[PDB]
Amino acid sequence: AMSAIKPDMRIKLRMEGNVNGHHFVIDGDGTGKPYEGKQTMDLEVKEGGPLPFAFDILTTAFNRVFVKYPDNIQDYFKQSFPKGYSWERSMTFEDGGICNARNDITMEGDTFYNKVRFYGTNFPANGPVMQKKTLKWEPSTEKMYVRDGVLTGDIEMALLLEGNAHYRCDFRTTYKAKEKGVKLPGAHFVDHAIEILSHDKDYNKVKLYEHAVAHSG
């Protein structure tokens, strides 16, 4: 049988968000190569712009289907389709900032649909997020393992800032296939690299790119 996952897929996304009380809506239109672990999104703020905080804190919320998995590691996410899966994420920043995010991922035809919710709070008014001092996320390694019976990914993240410093964050994401029969994979790692390829001056429009590869170390 031919895989539910097609080698060239489109992506549709809407995020409803609130960071330090600032409400916003962002739409995404993208394409990706699931078996190459590559995807590109064009994002557009639809409400609440210009955003008064660093766009970078949102970008990892804009799907682990787009990972190049070797044949010796079980691919939980590609096995989650056609039905799909969802994830919940906590992001705990070094200065007390805290974000919680969720994505519900479904498939219709050649397109992944993403229903994203994003909540951030406790960011200091003088900190780099509210002051828009971020430059990029550094490439990262996500540790995939089963925690309390649920596939979980832990990441030590780092935002490069203006002025020779990093702003660090702990990610924990829980991943759940909609079909409860999908077998849990063995522990492994996923290397990520996310980058903004271009953006407007006020980040109303952003082009985003991610490359990810799975490995056993």
Author numbering: 0 to 61, 65 to 219
Q: Any passages from the paper?
A:
Photoconvertible fluorescent proteins (PCFPs) are commonly employed in super‐resolution microscopy techniques such as Photo‐Activated Localization Microscopy (PALM), single‐particle‐tracking PALM (sptPALM) and more recently MINFLUX (Balzarotti et al., 2017). We systematically characterized the maturation speed of mEos‐derived PCFPs in Escherichia coli and found that, in contrast to pcStar and mEosEM, several variants such as mEos2, mEos3.1, mEos3.2, and mEos4b mature extremely slowly. In this work, we present a comprehensive investigation of the maturation speed of PCFPs from the mEos family and propose strategies to considerably reduce the maturation time of the monomeric, bright, and fixation‐resistant mEos4b variant (Paez‐Segala et al., 2015). Through a structure‐guided mutagenesis strategy, we developed a strategy to reduce the day‐long maturation time of mEos4b by nearly two orders of magnitude without significantly impacting its molecular brightness and photophysical performance under single‐molecule imaging conditions.
Similarly, we hypothesized that the L93M mutation, which distinguishes mEos3.2 from pcStar and mEos4b from mEosEM, could be pivotal in the significant reduction in maturation time observed for pcStar and mEosEM. In contrast, the L93M mutant showed a drastically decreased apparent maturation time of approximately 80 min, a more than 20‐fold improvement relative to the mEos4b parent and better than any other L93 substitution we have tested. Despite this improvement, the maturation rate of mEos4b‐L93M remained approximately three‐fold slower compared to that of pcStar or mEosEM, both of which also have a methionine at position 93. As a first step towards further improvements, we sought to understand the rationale behind the observed accelerated maturation for mEos4b‐L93M. The only significant difference (beside the L93M mutation) was the presence of an extra water molecule in the vicinity of the chromophore, which is well ordered as evidenced by the clear electron density map at this position. This water molecule (W1 hereafter) is within hydrogen‐bonding distance of the sulfur atom of M93 and the hydroxyl group of T59. First, the L93M mutation enlarges a hydrophobic pocket adjacent to the chromophore and stabilizes a single ordered water molecule (W1) that bridges T59 and R91, subtly repositioning the catalytic arginine. In both computed structural models, the amide group of Q60 replaces the water molecule W1 observed in the mEos4b‐L93M structure, leading to a similar repositioning of the R91 side chain relative to T59. Significant acceleration of mEos4b maturation was achieved by modifying the immediate environment of R91, a residue known to play a key role in catalyzing maturation.
